[PDB]
Design a protein around this ligand. Structure first.
Ligand SMILES: C#C[C@]1(O)CC[C@H]2[C@@H]3CCc4cc(O)ccc4[C@H]3CC[C@@]21C
Ligand SMILES: C#C[C@]1(O)CC[C@H]2[C@@H]3CCc4cc(O)ccc4[C@H]3CC[C@@]21C
Lengths: 271, 271
């Protein structure tokens, strides 16, 4: 019940996803690993401990490294995983940038709006991709040879975590995830966007395509209001983006760690 | 019931031990860690898998790294822990060399015999020190922030492992361990020793001191024949030294890894 244009639209997104989502994280390499104003530090300390993960590395040889993070003891140890997570997020951002560049509707926007949209949405698309490797049973993001496992439902109070669990429970198709990415990417109201009307019309077409996809392929009572649920999650994701952007900038202010690509995307000038 | 000379002898050994045994391994640093002719390889493969350990690193910040070694899959991965163990053994050898140098009876030997005795006994003294940090309940050598845990009584078939368990069960005093070190160190029949008679008389005095120590301080039926048990263990330790020296040289032959200090001690010339 999709139009030809809607079918072509999904095919281009799925193509873009297939070409640019390293789902096994096989090419994530050379990353850093953890070693072997007072009001600011207090807030930053709060920000950081709200998402504790251990990390597992399975070697190509069958060996396994496992890292359990330190407790907060009033020192710099709370930052131990930041270089690694900066490297992972950087790797993901590159995939997201490549994704957007492969899409015709994106390529056709002026370069200034392309940059503005990626700056506005990179984090969100990263999270959408991360959700597809999230294991809600084990509380683990399974990134190929790397695993990030949540450390021991006071966990669901954390908006990012609540987001991943709730989104996972929707049991979305690849197509629905990639349409969510498109809808997030083509948000007409990111800071600095000039072609507000063009971007708005594109977003609307992605949303219509998604709504139609769900109607054509999901007759089950469980999936009533699925389209509206997804849109609500996208709104929540935008809120989480704003929150984590401020968390990032707060850390950066007292403890610099953003990679150049991160700085570029989050507006850090280097001065 | 010890003579004054025997008491002075134990005091000098205990002093030497106290000065040169880093029991917390606090100064073991900058070590390597595992990454993130056919008949020879077959034997070497057998040699290596006969002692599997996982490794734990507790960080000063409370973080914990844990390494589980790979299975043998016909490749170079069986060597993954060798650089680390070379670094640890090297660190231990330095302590053993320092131990010997602090002892009057050793200092008074000609420099050529000093070298010959250290070459002959360094491995044995290393093992004697390692036994004092061996936890027989957990099958773990507890080396301060580093732990080496035996991987899951087919284990007791391995002579080195049988040695550590049996020696631990004797529940020796610090004094008895350090006398064992002396007896091993002053073995008159290591290759190249010139002052055979002098070294022999020294060893005999350490053994007499040990026997007297046990008689003076251990009246319990459990400790009957303790001196003879210890001497039997020293003989076994010498056998294990010969075995592991040949294992080391077999590995080295197809996969070089010995540090310069190891090469020096085990007779590798660099050519
Ligand atoms: C603070 C804080 C946190 O809640 C814990 C870790 C922080 C993330 C660290 C890495 C990272 C990378 C990005 O590209 C963007 C954001 C972040 C931080 C966001 C706030 C986090 C999750
Ligand atoms: C082979 C073999 C083994 O049984 C497994 C690991 C080998 C040790 C590796 C490091 C090391 C260092 C030394 O100074 C002396 C010997 C060794 C090797 C001995 C044989 C071992 C235990």
């Amino acid at each position: 019940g999709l139009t030809e244009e809607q079918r072509m639209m999904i095919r281009e997104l799925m193509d873009a996803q297939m070409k640019t989502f390293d789902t096994t994280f096989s090419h994530f390499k050379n990353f850093r690993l953890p070693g072997v104003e007072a009001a600011k530090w207090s807030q930053v300390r709060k920000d950081l401990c709200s998402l504790k993960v251990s990390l597992q590395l399975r070697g190509e040889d069958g060996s396994v490294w496992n890292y359990k993070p330190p407790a907060d003891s009033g020192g710099k140890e709370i930052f131990s995983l930041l270089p690694h997570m900066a490297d992972m997020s950087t790797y993901m951002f590159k995939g997201i940038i490549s994704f957007a560049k492969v899409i015709s509707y994106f390529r056709d926007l002026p370069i200034e709006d392309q940059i503005s949209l990626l700056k506005g949405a990179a984090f969100e698309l990263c999270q959408l991709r991360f959700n597809t490797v999230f294991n809600a049973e084990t509380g683990t993001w399974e990134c190929g040879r790397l695993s990030y496992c949540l450390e021991d439902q006071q966990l669901l109070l954390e908006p990012m975590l609540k987001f991943h669990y709730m989104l996972k429970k929707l049991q979305l198709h690849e197509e629905e995830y990639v349409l969510m990415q498109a809808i997030s990417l083509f948000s007409p109201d990111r800071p600095g966007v000039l072609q507000h009307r063009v971007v708005d019309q594109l977003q609307e077409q992605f949303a219509i395509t998604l709504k139609s996809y769900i109607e054509c392929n999901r007759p089950q009572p469980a999936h009533r209001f699925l389209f509206l649920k997804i849109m609500a999650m996208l709104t929540e994701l935008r809120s989480i983006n704003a929150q984590h952007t401020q968390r990032l900038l707060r850390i950066q202010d007292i403890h610099p760690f953003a990679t150049p690509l991160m700085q570029e995307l989050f507006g850090i000038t280097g001065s």
